[PDB]
Point group: C4
């Protein structure tokens, strides 16, 4: 259920901007205030104008789109939305750039707390290069938070190069076990699976070509942090004050943290909570795991 | 049949320049006025001096040649042709540079509406790198428009490295199915096959080495554009005012658009016509496909 | 046995700094005075503040850490340690940078006599790129001097990508024969094996996954130098005045050089001693080899 | 037989410089006057001080060495040799740099007529990268002129990585058929084999490891030029005035050009003679080939 403050931030984008929106919906994590957020694939501007309010004036939203005309349209509405939001200065910059070349875009290393994306981004050929660029621009303790399509089996290249597959936007889908490998080699913590929904294939020829392989739309959090010291298992208590998730914080599909409850967490979950922006939101004292997005999706 | 205005632009290059022309003939698309056109392999200057007239003074022609002496000769004749054409300032720039390194040449991203080439360019070892540079320098809705040699079968490397093959300028030829793969991975729309002529092999040793493989000279349009929104199937009417193609526009080997006729077109053809410079030339309302250049050439 | 001057340099780092130390211990070569030393993975600052004293004010220590907060903490204590050491100006610089990109860090080519590392560095995926950057920043005759984990057999990628393996910090371990290959292709002399200790595997799933493969922690010196001329076999005499190794210099596991003794050495060892900073420490006149770290550790 | 002017240029290097020479001997092409010559692996300076005289003051010698101390020694003697040679200013520059990174060395594209090397250069792991840098810094019509070790058979990787092989400086040797492949892909004309001498192996273990494979030391000219137009087969007459090769010019092992004789040459040889600096030395009118260095060496 879309928390109210997000619903209302949506209602407050200029209707022209919202009219021009191509996408799958906001894929957006929790606790956004004061953050620097990079929006991969900013399009005509809607998500960034949502985030502008959600991070407030101490925060910043950078949007990057490969289409100069989109960037021009988005920038048309900067002053409108900065006025409507009562902001003395703009907290949103739009860049024309290619997402696998964030450096050429001008985005510095460790400059953003969070990276989110429009689902058009799942239609690169090269996912690894995107993850490397996201990792480079992410601050310590920041997260890549994003939805994409994965496959149940490792498809042969000849099937991934197939015109039918690319016709259904299932081009570039990773075998799901591949995501963790990429994170391991790039420097991310293991992917936190949050949610997963099976994709039904209406296409008859595609039904033939893929075989027993299935497809899933799934959301993962990828955290960037460093091991400054030994970590023990820890207990955490959610203090209950993240906007729109006061009562409980569904962090991933293994951990829902209900306000005030004492939860024991593994070394990595604890490192993530300690090193991220969530640390302000938990009391952390020292002293059945789903990963497979198809089992997750099957169990609804 | 060479449209008159092209014939006459040819007649108007300084006879010295035209004398020094090594090539296969003008491979040149329609509707050139006001465009920025990059000529890969400008040689001594003829094609660029043709294009200078065809785009007019609001337009620009950049030529790039790997041979400094060619560039010097071409530039010798800038003022001659700018006078003859009645242009206030020059609309052509000549660059000494290698075509797989257009960045080092100084050509910016999204700076040219069209990229064409001299057939010497089909004699790179690395076609993909050339296509990546053409994609990068091309504006949104622009086209790479070019002729090259393709093969009917995937030749082994031991045959593509053969000195006989390279002796007939058939070195670097792609297996024709490869072109679409490269476009898919680089960011181009699917190649529009325009025309195709089988190459006869007079060489007896080559007859031996290639076997049942055949070779074709074929022209493709590769468009660069982005998916800002859903596209439906559309109808288009050609308004009939492209210089030299008033009565009808042969866009590719699947679509000839006769003036005033209502043609239903697929989602991609419509995206190309909507996003390119051809949009000015069509009324577009929302409402048997040859790809194989050897089938195309056989049917003449 | 830790030479006294190192022990005392350790005792003289601010207790806060030393408190924050994650690592395997100082892996540090001999004859450090006046040198420029790069510390890969400087952490919160301890090793660099040790080296600051060991190289003295004519020398320099650069530390590089991928974690900006570590760099900030380390730099908090620059003035404390420069005062305590009686140094007119600082001889340590701390950089926030990633070790496989020393160029972007700002470290010039041939700017450092020695490169050492924290064992967290053995947890890169890409060892070769690290070695290329160490070769580039190293002066002629300088050394990469470092400890890491190697394997007795070439593990498949199936197994190196395994979450158990990476869980024990044995991710990224090279098959030991690979080290010399990398040095050959990068420009290093052959690795000098110094010491080696077998790693015991307490993990029961890992016991199953690796099979008959074993793991070793081993220290190698990799020297960078160029062949300006023919080299003969040579004799060398250690003059006996390297701080903390007066009596004898254990150079590697094939050569311990006792003060005053005349030792015949091969062309390669002689080139290294001639072209390095050890040349000041030997008289060099022109006239059974262990390489395998598992044989070394077994003995 | 070493032409006198080379012998005398050697005698005129400061004996200190000549004392410090590690190498295989001058590998140096003909007609050097006024040229820009890059010396890969300049060492302590001897070859460059030879070339300084051979090109004269209108020419230039750049030497590049990976060892800063060598560069310092070489530069110690600049003024000595510039005085002795009666030159108004220095015509040699010494650079500390790595030969596979001539760009970082500061050597511009198309800046040198000729590239020669010290045989230590044959001890890179990466020959192709060296050839790419030599192609890039070479002017149109210039030549890479160099001696190296090649093998009669394609050795497996495990044997090329062998510490015995690398112990005899036979590390990095190419299979001889590989040289032409690299030239084809880089942009060089086919290698001109000039001379070849078999290497005898007096190592017992190496005798075991390589098997039936043999090794040869061989000299090739690699020319860089572009195809500005059709080339016919041609006749050439050597005008007989190249210093030290007045009576005849042994160009390669297929062509010795005796003064005044009329020789018919193939399209490629003619392009090379037309586009190089040798053109001044021939009258060129438009009107049994050894390649295998082991057959060449066997026939002495």
């Amino acid at each position: 259920p879309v928390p109210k403050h997000i619903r209302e931030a949506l209602q407050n984008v200029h209707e022209e901007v919202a009219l021009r929106y191509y996408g799958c919906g906001l894929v957006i994590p929790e606790h956004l205030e004061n953050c620097w957020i990079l929006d991969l694939g900013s399009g005509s501007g809607r998500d960034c104008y949502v985030l502008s309010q959600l991070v407030g004036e101490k925060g910043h939203v950078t949007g990057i789109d490969m289409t100069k005309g989109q960037v021009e349209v988005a920038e048309k509405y900067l002053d409108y939305h900065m006025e409507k939001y009562g902001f003395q200065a703009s907290n949103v910059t739009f860049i024309h750039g290619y997402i696998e070349k964030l450096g050429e875009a001008g985005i510095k290393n460790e400059s953003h707390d969070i990276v989110v994306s429009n689902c058009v981004i799942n239609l690169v050929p090269d996912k690894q290069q995107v993850l490397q660029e996201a990792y480079r621009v992410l601050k310590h303790g920041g997260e890549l938070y994003f939805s994409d399509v994965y496959t149940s089996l490792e498809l042969p290249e000849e099937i991934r190069t197939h015109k039918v597959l690319w016709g259904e936007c299932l081009g570039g889908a990773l075998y799901w076990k591949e995501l963790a490998v990429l994170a391991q080699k790039i420097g991310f913590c293991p992917p936190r699976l949050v949610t997963a929904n099976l994709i039904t294939i209406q296409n008859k020829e595609l039904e033939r070509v893929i075989g027993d392989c299935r497809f899933v739309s799934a959301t993962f959090r990828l955290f960037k942090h460093s091991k400054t010291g030994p970590t023990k298992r820890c207990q955490v208590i959610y203090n209950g004050g993240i906007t729109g998730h006061e009562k409980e914080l569904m962090f991933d599909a293994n951990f829902t943290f209900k306000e005030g409850e004492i939860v024991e967490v593994d070394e990595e979950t604890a490192a993530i909570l300690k090193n991220s922006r969530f640390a302000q939101d938990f009391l952390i004292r020292p002293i059945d795991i789903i990963t497979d997005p198809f089992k997750l999706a099957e169990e609804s």
